[PDB]
Design a protein around this ligand. Structure first.
Ligand SMILES: [Mn+2]
Ligand SMILES: [Mn+2]
Ligand SMILES: [Mn+2]
Ligand SMILES: [Mn+2]
Ligand SMILES: [Mn+2]
Ligand SMILES: [Mn+2]
Ligand SMILES: [Mn+2]
Ligand SMILES: [Mn+2]
Lengths: 282, 282
């Protein structure tokens, strides 16, 4: 059973969320199995950012057991700006554990190196998720995002517990039940960093959303990349903390890393500067 | 100075928000002057619903001093559903005090009776407002929405304190600085009640947003209607509580109404059913 351990108050630099397995903290990056049900294509997704929020929370790569923390820019907490007609993230945003977008090789289909983090997942279900949540989803498609010139695949997924899950099995179903979502998704990842001063991003295949099978192929590739990484065989792991507590055959295995995690110190959400309210029309 | 006195916790049946003048409760409907600056046509807007929220809160016509209260639906609190690509309300939503959409007579431009309540206001500023807030705004334009067959004008306004206030003076400036907003606004009021089983709404003038001058005329008309209502000279006030504490010349004037209001009893917001999370595609 997966639960969460929160340190500090949300919206602060001290905020941390570790994922626990039977009350024992594990690495949110390496210790959670990619597959919930491999042959049925059911995955374990780690939710980082709930739909309609702004705080750029993520599984941090350079901290032991890889707790979810808030990203920063120039020493300041990072909040993704509101871009009309969107409000924060338009999907439950997160990642697939045991995956890695290899930065050391130029990916052929995109002609760019990976963005050095687990593959990204867009969960389109009706219910709003919570940070640290490990839910089971089924992949329906994938879009090749080139984020600031880097391979940044976005998987289109749906919680298996969603009332609409049995009716979704491939990408075309998405447009069927969620008309306009894929187009909005394209636009979002194209312009979300413009209010930051960054250039507009671009998509490969003209932003086309590839089907479920294509999605599985990419997911499995990034899984193998992580297999190489965790095995300690990458040419450059970039200082990523490979500490884990469930993989005894790997060189960075350390059961003790779990007990070293302080106890929960959950505090109420800290306030967010009023400027994040701003809706940008860009 | 205007402040708010909160009763109970937000998102509960006991929730109530009264507006105070120098510490004493006044009628949110009749005691708040319509004009902040009449020479400059700066209006006082009573905010009911903050942008991106779902709780259907509004100035209560049948309660003394007209505290803002959430509408109910079959014994439960009533929320407006999320209609893709929108999240709850897309504007700081409220009304202009001392105005009334006359239900006893048909409005010429729309050929329908008014919806029996203060003229509505959509504040397009960046900062998200709060319930019970009285803010000074400039009128930019107006839209003639027919809500369920009733005259339901929507004034487009901006907080004078908004960074963009100086640059917005007439309707055309809304499209110039908030491109897409007017079209999104048209669509929003047209479909927002569809998930509730209601027919799609319609707009007069093909949804055209009339300019400031036009808007000023309509507002003036609704203000004249409230003067007839507050003076008790309407043919039918529809059981509206006309109790006020600042209009000594009206038959329902009663200063003691202010002292009858219980003291604030603020409590933390109550959780909202997860089903309001749902994003409808209509
Ligand atoms: Mn980044
Ligand atoms: Mn990521
Ligand atoms: Mn990215
Ligand atoms: Mn990424
Ligand atoms: Mn109403
Ligand atoms: Mn109203
Ligand atoms: Mn209405
Ligand atoms: Mn109305």
């Amino acid at each position: 059973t997966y639960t969460t351990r929160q340190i500090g108050a949300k919206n602060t630099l001290e905020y941390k969320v570790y994922i626990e397995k039977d009350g024992k903290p594990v690495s949110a990056f390496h210790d959670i199995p990619l597959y919930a049900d491999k042959e049925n294509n059911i995955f374990n997704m780690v939710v980082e950012i709930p739909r309609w929020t702004n705080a750029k929370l993520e599984i941090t790569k350079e901290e032991t057991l890889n707790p979810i923390i808030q990203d920063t820019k120039k020493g300041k907490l990072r909040f993704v700006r509101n871009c009309f007609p969107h409000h924060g993230y338009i999907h439950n945003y997160g990642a697939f554990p045991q995956t890695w977008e290899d930065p050391n090789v130029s990916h052929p289909e995109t002609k760019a190196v990976g963005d050095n983090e687990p593959i990204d997942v867009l969960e389109i279900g009706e219910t709003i998720a919570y940070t640290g949540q490990v839910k089971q989803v089924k992949a329906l498609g994938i879009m090749a995002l080139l984020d600031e010139g880097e391979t940044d695949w976005k998987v289109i997924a749906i919680d298996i517990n969603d009332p609409l899950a049995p009716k979704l099995n491939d990408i075309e179903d998405v447009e069927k039940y969620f008309p306009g979502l894929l187009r909005a998704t394209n636009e979002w990842f194209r312009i979300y960093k413009i209010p930051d001063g960054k250039p507009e991003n671009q998509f490969a295949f003209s932003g086309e959303a590839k089907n479920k099978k294509y999605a599985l192929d990419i997911i499995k590739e990034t899984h193998d990349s992580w297999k190489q990484l965790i095995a300690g065989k990458s040419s450059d792991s970039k200082g990523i903390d490979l500490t884990n507590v469930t993989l005894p055959d790997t060189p960075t295995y350390s059961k003790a890393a779990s007990d070293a995690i302080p106890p929960a110190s959950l505090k109420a959400d800290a306030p967010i500067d009023k400027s994040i309210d701003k809706w940008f029309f860009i």
